[PDB]
Design a protein around this ligand. Structure first.
Ligand code: MN
Ligand code: MN
Ligand code: MN
Ligand code: MN
Lengths: 287, 287
């Protein structure tokens, strides 16, 4: 039975990703958020509610990535060095999820926080998008999985990591790029720094598996990936309209969703699907 | 679908375990092992070989705990705050496993390190003892698991990290308690500091599940647990004879194995099985 040996490379990249993930280690106690109270209180109630809602959705996605996505993908890997990096990534999803609570405890009353988790837990769009992603992960709950099943779980993980978070990341970046909620904006920027590297790494692993598929299974997975892309897109378009119609930003965020969906695809070594468009410089300045 | 909400307690202990696990965070790059070369080179051939053999075994066990044990147990938990702790613990098993390589790269040649991993990978005792523990984890590879199956996976996990590692931990501690290989002994003490709290935590969760079992399943699990304890003890007696006969420390290590088996039992809220004996004061000083 094999032990992990870091003095003999199992691949060309797991060590550098390991070192970068651990270099980027952080926890919420390193950022005081209370100085955001000042700008929080100058936001309209629509702006506040949008911010809370998006953070709630992000919390849910990270809870699923830490609790199901990284653990079930990593258990089936044979590459012990790569497994290690995914275990570390998995812990950081929990650090991310807990981070949002740290922001909530400063910006919202105990009752307002109950409100938001009730809204998450009962939300039909969040349930649909989480249900879809996690159905690929739950296929892995069996002793032996096919390469195709593992590949599609990794596509789903990248689509979560690189694509589905961004309808949520948009708004904290937008506010931070205007000097509002800048402490919370820092925390969001730490999460994004981690997720950028998560997405690349999982996408490298997927590309490896794809090369081990037959020409046929390669076609089947391309067809499934395009369908998954578009089913999530339709959910995301409904989610952005729900969240941002009150504040006039639906078209802005839609551009940023498509931009990030193309980044996910590129992480998988696939061609972009959406035409390039001008993304808001204020959110680029919040990055 | 539920998101983790750290502003409402899901139990009355996960938060303090989360904080302590993260307070204890460390990385191998924080301990330079090069000052150990001095004492390494004054060890006899028998001593050097026993040290490399035990570090090899420990590398194997941490590999399985990070790669199967924490992930499969955590995925079935419903408590989202507890899940989070276990995912953090899972990443630190990979930090543990990688730390042994860090010790190896300073003490041993590339060829010497190949020799060790060839020996761990083909070792029949290490295979049997890993295989026994990992068989409880592999039962969890299915959509629905029983309370009984989860409980026995948690017993196995505590048996691994409160009991099975200690036939290995003994030697680094025994050397470090004589002022030898003290830098490596630091890294071993950091691993033990983690494992000590991993064990307590998994055992709290096991006790919770045991309370949700029927009286009859409670009896069945008590029986399985005692049988498991003793099957592993027999394997440990063979391992300790193989490793420590050459250096005159078999009876010393056997006492430390029993002591730590009693700790594992106590972590599960069970009675100790072995008499209290005096453990080698030199390993206590290494700790
Ligand atoms: Mn995350
Ligand atoms: Mn991630
Ligand atoms: Mn460990
Ligand atoms: Mn452990």
């Amino acid at each position: 039975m094999r032990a992990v040996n870091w003095n003999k490379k199992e691949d060309d990249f797991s060590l550098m990703f390991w070192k970068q993930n651990i270099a980027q280690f952080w926890t919420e106690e390193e950022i005081a958020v209370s100085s955001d109270k000042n700008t929080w209180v100058q936001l309209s109630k629509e702006e506040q509610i949008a911010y809370k809602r998006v953070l709630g959705g992000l919390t849910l996605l990270d809870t699923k990535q830490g609790g199901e996505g990284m653990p079930l993908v990593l258990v089936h890997l044979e590459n012990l060095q790569a497994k290690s990096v995914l275990a570390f990534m998995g812990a950081m999803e929990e650090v991310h999820a807990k981070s949002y609570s740290h922001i909530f405890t400063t910006l919202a009353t105990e009752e307002e926080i109950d409100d938001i988790f009730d809204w998450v837990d009962n939300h039909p769009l969040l349930e649909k998008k989480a249900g879809i992603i996690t159905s690929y992960y739950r296929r892995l709950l069996k002793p032996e999985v096919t390469k195709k099943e593992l590949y599609m779980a990794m596509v789903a993980s990248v689509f979560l990591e690189s694509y589905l978070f961004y309808s949520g990341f948009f708004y904290p970046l937008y506010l931070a790029g205007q000097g509002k909620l800048t402490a919370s904006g820092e925390i969001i920027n730490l999460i994004i720094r981690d997720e950028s590297i998560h997405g690349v790494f999982v996408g490298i692993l997927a590309q490896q598996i794809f090369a081990e598929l037959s020409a046929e299974e390669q076609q089947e997975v391309q067809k499934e990936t395009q369908e998954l892309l578009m089913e999530l897109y339709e959910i995301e378009m409904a989610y952005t309209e729900e969240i941002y119609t009150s504040i006039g930003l639906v078209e802005d965020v839609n551009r940023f969703v498509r931009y990030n969906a193309n980044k996910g695809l590129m992480n998988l070594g696939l061609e972009p699907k959406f035409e390039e468009e001008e993304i808001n410089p204020i959110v680029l300045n919040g990055l």
